[PDB]
Design a protein around this ligand. Structure first.
Ligand SMILES: [Cl-]
Length: 263
């Protein structure tokens, strides 16, 4: 709906910074609405979903096992590791790392998973290898969150991220089992409350991943829809703003309410 873009433009005005927006049909992949679809923004923690899509693709290919256990040490823990910091003794399985990376945005869990696939370069190669020549991961947690203005390291564009997410949730890229696990982890997201979830009416489905970093960077990727099933993908990114976190959350929640109102 073109009225949703009026709210997207208003978010830009309120944040004093760029906002990129894409709403996609889940079934056809068609772009329904877009704003700055081809401009780069920092991935921050939204890359965690792409990381576990690359992990799941290796599982599908018999090179990795969801039940494999990894052990690690205090020297591996970086900031914002609420789950991994609790399992130093027992270690965690690849499945439990993905869960922590997606549902809790656990940073050491992302680094551990990155090491399983050969680092940021290999994530970028996975994305390159599934048709996405835009999205790129260059660094590890936490430095990937730096959001230096005009730096293309650790960035995507709203349209590239939206079509990639759709290919991960729907294509024959991944087996049914893998596609269902990725979305089930997204649906279990615990750290994106004040964004699209705060505008979502009772009974609607949402599977999302949010991100926050430095210099006002903030974003969210989602599969959502009425009647307890996803029917659309939405991607929202912003960076640069000096507005506080509460105000960035509110602008994204208001984009979400406007999208719902105009569904
Ligand atoms: Cl490993």
């Amino acid at each position: 709906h073109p009225e949703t873009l009026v709210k997207v433009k208003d978010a830009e005005d309120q944040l004093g910074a760029r906002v990129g927006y894409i709403e996609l049909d889940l079934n056809s992949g068609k772009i329904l609405e877009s704003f700055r679809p081809e401009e780069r923004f920092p991935l921050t923690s939204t890359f965690k979903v792409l990381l576990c899509g690359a992990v799941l693709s290796r599982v599908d290919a018999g090179q990795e096992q969801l039940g494999r256990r990894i052990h690690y040490s205090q020297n591996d823990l970086v900031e914002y590791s609420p789950v991994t910091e609790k399992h130093l003794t027992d270690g965690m399985t690849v499945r439990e790392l993905c869960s922590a990376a997606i549902t809790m945005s656990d940073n050491t869990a992302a680094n551990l998973l990155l090491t399983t696939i050969g680092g940021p370069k290999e994530l970028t190669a996975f994305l390159h290898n599934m048709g996405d020549h835009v999205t790129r991961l260059d660094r590890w947690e936490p430095e990937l969150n730096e959001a230096i203005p005009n730096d293309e390291r650790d960035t995507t564009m709203p349209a590239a991220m939206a079509t990639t997410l759709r290919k991960l949730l729907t294509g024959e890229l991944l087996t049914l089992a893998s596609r269902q696990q990725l979305i089930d982890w997204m649906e279990a997201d615990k750290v994106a409350g004040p964004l699209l979830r705060s505008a979502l009416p009772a009974g609607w489905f949402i599977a999302d991943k949010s991100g926050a970093g430095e210099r006002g960077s903030r974003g969210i990727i989602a599969a959502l829809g009425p009647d307890g099933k996803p029917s659309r993908i939405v991607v929202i990114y912003t960076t640069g703003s000096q507005a506080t976190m509460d105000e960035r959350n509110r602008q994204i929640a208001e984009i979400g309410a406007s999208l719902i109102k105009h569904w």
